[PDB]
Design a protein around this motif. Structure first.
Motif, mmCIF file in Angstrom:
data_model
loop_
_atom_site.group_PDB
_atom_site.id
_atom_site.type_symbol
_atom_site.label_atom_id
_atom_site.label_comp_id
_atom_site.label_asym_id
_atom_site.label_seq_id
_atom_site.Cartn_x
_atom_site.Cartn_y
_atom_site.Cartn_z
ATOM 1 N N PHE A 1 -7.528 2.448 -12.732
ATOM 2 C CA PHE A 1 -8.284 1.875 -12.383
ATOM 3 C C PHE A 1 -9.156 1.600 -13.640
ATOM 4 N N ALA B 1 -4.417 9.936 -3.653
ATOM 5 C CA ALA B 1 -4.077 8.889 -3.764
ATOM 6 C C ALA B 1 -5.823 7.988 -4.322
ATOM 7 N N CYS C 1 -5.539 9.318 -8.441
ATOM 8 C CA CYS C 1 -4.974 8.493 -9.266
ATOM 9 C C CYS C 1 -5.459 6.869 -9.427
ATOM 10 N N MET C 2 -6.298 6.469 -8.547
ATOM 11 C CA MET C 2 -6.477 4.869 -8.228
ATOM 12 C C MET C 2 -7.572 5.349 -9.375
ATOM 13 N N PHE D 1 -2.093 -0.749 -1.314
ATOM 14 C CA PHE D 1 -3.394 -1.575 -1.711
ATOM 15 C C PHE D 1 -4.533 -2.247 -0.950
HETATM 16 C C1 LIG Z 1 -2.802 -1.679 -11.064
HETATM 17 C C2 LIG Z 1 -3.584 -0.920 -9.238
HETATM 18 C C3 LIG Z 1 -3.367 -2.036 -8.248
HETATM 19 C C4 LIG Z 1 -2.984 0.477 -9.419
HETATM 20 C C5 LIG Z 1 -3.007 0.826 -7.631
HETATM 21 C C6 LIG Z 1 -2.721 2.070 -8.123
HETATM 22 C C7 LIG Z 1 -1.875 2.989 -6.944
HETATM 23 C C8 LIG Z 1 -1.493 1.394 -6.195
HETATM 24 C C9 LIG Z 1 -1.232 2.990 -7.171
HETATM 25 C C10 LIG Z 1 -1.623 4.652 -8.552
HETATM 26 C C11 LIG Z 1 -1.400 6.282 -7.463
HETATM 27 C C12 LIG Z 1 0.219 5.776 -6.315
HETATM 28 C C13 LIG Z 1 -0.009 6.989 -5.648
HETATM 29 C C14 LIG Z 1 -0.191 8.293 -5.997
HETATM 30 C C15 LIG Z 1 0.884 9.187 -5.318
HETATM 31 C C16 LIG Z 1 1.120 8.719 -4.153
HETATM 32 C C17 LIG Z 1 1.203 10.054 -2.831
HETATM 33 C C18 LIG Z 1 2.090 9.423 -1.994
HETATM 34 O O1 LIG Z 1 2.518 10.638 -0.505
HETATM 35 C C19 LIG Z 1 2.220 8.203 -1.326
HETATM 36 C C20 LIG Z 1 2.212 7.014 -2.415
HETATM 37 C C21 LIG Z 1 0.711 7.084 -3.071
HETATM 38 C C22 LIG Z 1 -0.161 7.228 -2.776
HETATM 39 C C23 LIG Z 1 0.998 6.377 -4.744
HETATM 40 C C24 LIG Z 1 1.041 5.147 -3.714
HETATM 41 C C25 LIG Z 1 0.781 3.705 -5.577
HETATM 42 C C26 LIG Z 1 -0.912 4.846 -5.918
HETATM 43 C C27 LIG Z 1 -1.515 4.245 -4.609
#
Ligand SMILES: CC(C)CCC[C@@H](C)[C@H]1CC[C@H]2[C@@H]3CC=C4C[C@@H](O)CC[C@]4(C)[C@H]3CC[C@]12C
Ligand SMILES: CCc1c2c(nc3ccc(O)cc13)-c1cc3c(c(=O)n1C2)COC(=O)[C@]3(O)CC
Ligand SMILES: CC(C)CCC[C@@H](C)[C@H]1CC[C@H]2[C@@H]3CC=C4C[C@@H](O)CC[C@]4(C)[C@H]3CC[C@]12C
Lengths: 566, 566
Positions: free
Chosen positions: B552, B544, B547-548, B483
């Motif tokens: 957001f 990652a 997808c962040m 996070f």
């Molecule tokens: C509402 C807010 C807090 C959302 C935060 C976005 C984060 C926590 C979410 C969104 C996409 C997600 C990531 C997408 C996929 C991966 C690749 C995997 O190999 C490790 C985990 C990881 C990296 C996930 C971890 C959690 C993640 C990073």
């Protein structure tokens, strides 16, 4: 005690061009628009402007205005310059505490506090807090009375009011204006710059002087004002307000052509004849240091919304750091771990003093008004607030910090190292606050004060013994390592930290060890950072930080002292 | 096209209690104090308030108000909601560009732009910028005309004005009010809430409706208003302004006792008789996406005082980092040196996006007014500003950064590593801006938006592979490493950086080397940080981070969409 004024020429462009006239010991008023010389006249008649551009003379009952004219004459500022988070009782005690205690006792000056609370009629909410946009209290109609009553304790002969009905719920506005009519019954000279009276207090005017674009329109009583412009050329019939028609001539239903008729009017010539016949600190230092320190301390825990905000984010930070580094091991992952956290605690304290810039700027008009009125010298104010809102405030992100973090890690299991780390963390915090105080004292807005300081605490963040390894950069730029606050933090936090332990299990590497680039002992690590290993080298930063404090505080003490306070 | 309204009951406490009456296709006005229901009436008659608390009906010429009533009826907001740093010509082109291009050509709708510039009389400064507190331009008297003229291009039947003379240099105020009298000659229904007219435009009133404390005082024409209160009980003699005496009854020279006389007056009963007889998007997506992106882009380099401020502090930062690390050696002081700078470049970019919160809040009233008037859907505005003031803005603290820093160090002498580092630094910057955009979109002040985000980017600063060594903290809290934005930065900036070089001169330590805790090779250092050595592990952060970005941005897209816009 009457005021008079003759041939005022004021240049910054001449803003107060040809003003002259007399007053009466009653209720005088300054009219006109805000665009004119209306507000700038009242400042010069209250000795608020600088006497640099001044050319004319102001004669109070024939005598020129003495040096302590500003000591005896109260000037109520336009905004609420009352202390918002203080009780109205102790708000009125404060101005009584600095202008009067040279001879009389405390219980002698208590009676005039109780005298001015009743002729103001403020015994009703006398034990309540004033109120601001943060916290409520006494309503806004009686906030102006507290500003007026504050300047009545020392005995006034002339009383000034800077625009006393700027947004005062006009049903409530009349009550304070009758009180000034009730105050003038003693002989108080009330010269204000009223902003658009409609008709009600317009009939209770003893004298008035209307100005426009730096030009005198008219001076005279209000009963003589209605018969003026009917005999001047622009008629004011029924359903036409008088005080708003008098500014309609400069709207144009020209700028000097209206002002010429006053010269050959039957008002100005006989004021020239009487003008031509009149033509031919106090309180101890330690008494001042106590009372101003009593005010902000009461202001701090009178509004503990931003004080306790810093405490909680500190205690939650220390628990989080304690939960992260819950037991730091002496493995190979110690050096990156213990220099990491000890980097973080300094550069937090260097950065969390961004909120020390709001110390001289949220009450700057509270400082200019209280200095020029004669309450105290500047070094009393500056030494007063530091040991009241910088010393006890920035002493507890530090001693609250170590006790929650040093036991959750076990940095160095001693008591001197617990007591030197607690010392230096409050030493950085006193420094970088004052560094932030140095380039923010004596400004009006916090905007460029935060942008300039935060980009300055990045170059201090780089040269800090972590992101650089200062021994490896070239000496034409490595002199900049001394112009950085938390390097002195990070070195002092490291020198008491790498002294006896070995990050090298299964082997000993004191003087006889092969296979270098090992950094087993911390004393080997410190010469990789080039930190000297002398016990002088520990305290070498603290004196360097203490001499960083003094040069940053006296440049702030210079900046308040050489402030254009007119 | 006339308006009428009957028995309006409005609760939030009932704020609009018993309002009813008719209009006339002329110049209508809403009078009273700001404390009453004066401003709240005009919002409900312009369908600006929510219809939740609404109980009464508003009948336009007998017909109820349709769904696209707000599309055809212009509402001028009190403050200058004109774009300050735009030319008045292209300012008027903008509102023409989104409400009209469904059928007609560009050169067909150009004529009504030239028509409304002359009946406004704004051909004089038509090619000048408007002007704000940052930069000058057209004077403040004609800033209100640009707000009025902006809502005239689509054909209005009713026109609203929210307090059109709030500080407008009252000599200049009359000219726009005569223009509305000149605009009403076509049949435009002009309902405004004028704030204290003195007498001049008070004789040019077609209808008026004065309110007080949520109670109707009086509705009727201005020629019938003067004979009202003389026949009601409080007399208004000479030298008494009419529009200011009508509010003097609620000052008290009671709150409902004055409002009863209007019920048994000869004005309200015949309005009830006529009330009782009347009782029984448009533009394409890609056309919308272009034009809003044209506006802010022109707004960005129309005021390049804060845009070029970020460029210069970037170029000077990159030179300073380049001057500090001018040649980074592969000695033992490499790991502390190259992980230091590559820590700094991410957490700068994570923190220098503190100034991305000023994207939806410095023009929030520019968003609520332009959405509810029907200019565009929300996803058009949100996709418009991102590729205009977040995408080309936050793409150049990144590609300007690497080119000035990677050649002054020689990080990894390749071209893919130069091109993956340039990619990820703009990837963090797009993330942490949107993170700062997520918790700041749909707020009014930047105050708690900066305090909440900056203390959130400290916990991301800790869990970043530098100050912790994440592999060593316990797994009940090491889940918090995901996070955190710049950990994905710092890992990706490190994985392309520690792959082929050896920080161990005079020795080789691939698989056969004694004397551990050496960290000679960088791949040995990466497993000390626990970074996986797969080439998937490099790009694992970018997805990652990507997808962040999406989670957001769509929470920001949700927050603007579910905003209380009434
Ligand atoms: C509402 C807010 C807090 C959302 C935060 C976005 C984060 C926590 C979410 C969104 C996409 C997600 C990531 C997408 C996929 C991966 C690749 C995997 O190999 C490790 C985990 C990881 C990296 C996930 C971890 C959690 C993640 C990073
Ligand atoms: C040490 C933790 C810490 C930081 C910042 N601010 C804090 C505030 C409160 C607190 O408690 C801890 C804070 C901050 C700000 C910035 C940079 C940075 O590294 N840090 C670190 C990089 O450079 C920048 O431009 C800037 O954004 C300056 C605005
Ligand atoms: C106007 C501003 C920039 C003044 C900045 C204060 C700094 C740069 C000054 C003030 C006091 C000075 C320090 C006081 C004495 C010592 C101890 C000596 O063994 C090393 C130099 C050192 C540490 C000096 C370095 C420069 C110094 C730290």
């Amino acid at each position: 005690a009457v005021l008079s004024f003759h041939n005022i020429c004021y240049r910054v462009k001449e803003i107060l061009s040809n003003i002259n006239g007399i007053m009466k010991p009653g209720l005088n008023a300054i009219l006109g628009p805000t665009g004119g010389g209306k507000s700038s006249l009242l400042d010069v008649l209250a000795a608020r402007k600088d006497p640099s551009g001044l050319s004319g003379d102001v004669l109070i009952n024939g005598a020129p205005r003495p040096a302590n004219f500003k000591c005896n004459s109260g000037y109520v500022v336009q905004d609420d310059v009352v202390m918002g988070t203080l009780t109205v009782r102790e708000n009125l005690q404060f101005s009584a505490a600095l202008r009067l205690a040279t001879t009389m006792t405390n219980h002698e000056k208590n009676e005039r506090i109780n005298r001015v609370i009743q002729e103001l009629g403020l015994d009703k909410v006398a034990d309540s807090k004033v109120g601001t946009q943060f916290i409520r209290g006494v309503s806004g109609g009686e906030r102006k009375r507290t500003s007026i009553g504050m300047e009545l304790i020392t005995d006034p002969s002339i009383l000034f009011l800077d625009e006393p009905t700027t947004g005062l719920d006009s049903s409530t506005a009349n009550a304070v204006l009758l009180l000034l009519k009730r105050m003038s019954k003693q002989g108080r000279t009330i010269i204000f710059s009223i902003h658009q009276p409609r008709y009600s207090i317009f009939k209770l005017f003893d004298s008035l002087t209307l100005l426009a674009s730096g030009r005198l329109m008219f001076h005279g009583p209000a009963q003589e004002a209605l018969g003026y412009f009917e005999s001047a050329g622009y008629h004011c019939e029924a359903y036409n307000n008088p005080a708003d028609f008098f500014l309609d001539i400069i709207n144009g239903d020209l700028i000097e052509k209206l002002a010429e008729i006053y010269v050959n009017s039957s008002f100005y010539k006989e004021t020239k004849a009487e003008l031509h016949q009149l033509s031919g600190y106090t309180t101890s230092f330690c008494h001042q240091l106590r009372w101003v320190s009593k005010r902000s301390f009461k202001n701090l825990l009178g509004n503990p919304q931003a004080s306790i905000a810093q405490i909680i984010v500190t205690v939650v930070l220390g628990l989080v750091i304690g939960a992260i580094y819950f037991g730091l091991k002496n493995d190979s992952t110690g050096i990156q771990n213990r220099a990491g956290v000890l980097f973080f605690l300094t550069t937090n304290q260097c950065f969390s003093s961004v909120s020390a810039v709001e110390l001289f700027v949220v009450e700057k008009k509270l400082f200019i008004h209280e200095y020029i009125s004669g309450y105290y010298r500047v070094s009393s104010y500056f030494l007063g607030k530091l040991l009241s809102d910088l010393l006890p405030m920035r002493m507890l992100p530090s001693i609250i910090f170590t006790c929650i973090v040093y036991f959750m890690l076990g940095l160095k299991p001693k008591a001197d190292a617990f007591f030197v780390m607690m010392f230096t963390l409050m030493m950085v915090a006193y420094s970088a606050s004052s560094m932030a105080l140095a380039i923010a004292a004596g400004q009006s807005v916090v905007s460029v004060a935060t942008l300039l300081m935060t980009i300055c605490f990045v170059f201090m963040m780089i040269f800090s013994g972590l992101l650089v390894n200062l021994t490896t950069i070239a000496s034409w730029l490595s002199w900049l390592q001394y112009f950085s606050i938390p390097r002195y933090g990070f070195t002092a936090l490291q020198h008491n930290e790498f002294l006896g332990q070995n990050f090298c299990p299964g082997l000993n590497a004191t003087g006889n060890n092969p296979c270098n680039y090992a950094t087993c002992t911390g004393e080997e690590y410190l010469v990789k950072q080039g930190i000297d290993l002398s016990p002088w080298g520990l305290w070498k930063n603290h004196v360097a930080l203490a001499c960083m404090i003094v040069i940053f505080l006296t440049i702030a003490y210079l900046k308040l002292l050489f402030l254009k306070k007119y």
